[PDB]
Amino acid sequence: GSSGSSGSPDVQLATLAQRVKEVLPHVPLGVIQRDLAKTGCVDLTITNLLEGAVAFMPEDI
């Protein structure tokens, strides 16, 4: 049980948008953040972007 980097225990949207972005910088963060919510998996996002993969939705009055 070891880790490369010191240790950054954070899996927030940012942390995600980072990766997904790191792979696809072109795509905006605003959409990414959402696209992520549409699923919740960097890998997924990639595909979603590639094709579509859209479902679920948040709430807010």
Domains and CATH numbers, the chain: 9-54 (1.10.8.10)
Q: What is the DSSP letter of 60?
A: -
- The structure tokens 């963060």 sit at 29
DSSP H helices in the chain: 13-23, 29-38, 42-50
Rounded-to-integer distance, Cα 23 and Cα 43, Å: 10
46 near 33, Cβ under 8 Å?
no
Can you read off the two tokens belonging to residue 19?
Answer: 């990766």
- The structure tokens 């549409």 sit at 38
Rounded-to-integer distance, Cα 3 and Cα 7, Å: 7
**CA-only gyration radius of the chain, Å:** 13
Quote the distance between the C-alpha of residue 40 and its chain's center: 6
Rounded-to-integer distance, Cα 58 and Cα 25, Å: 24
Q: Tally the residues of the chain.
A: 61
Can you read off the two tokens belonging to residue 33?
Answer: 């953040």
Quote the distance between the C-alpha of residue 39 and its chain's center: 8
